[PDB]
Amino acid sequence: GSNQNNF
Ligand SMILES: [Zn+2]
């Protein structure tokens, strides 16, 4: 699966 971190 794909992953996104929005800090
Ligand atoms: Zn993955």
What would you note in describing this structure?
The PDB classes it as protein fibril. Keywords: prion, protein fibril. The assembly is monomeric. 1.15 A MicroED structure of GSNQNNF at 1.9 e- / A^2. By secondary structure, the chain is low in regular secondary structure. The protein contains no helices and no strands. The protein is rod-shaped. The N and C termini lie far apart (20 Å).
**β-strand number:** 0
Most strands sheet: none
Tell me the fraction of residues in β-strands, as a range. under 5%
The proportion of residues forming helix, as a percent range, comes to under 10%
Count of alpha and pi helical runs? 0
N/C terminus separation: 20 Å
**How would you sum up the global shape?**
rod-shaped
PDB class: protein fibril
Keywords: Amyloid fibril, prion, zinc binding, protein fibril
Assembly: monomeric
Entry title: 1.15 A MicroED structure of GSNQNNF at 1.9 e- / A^2
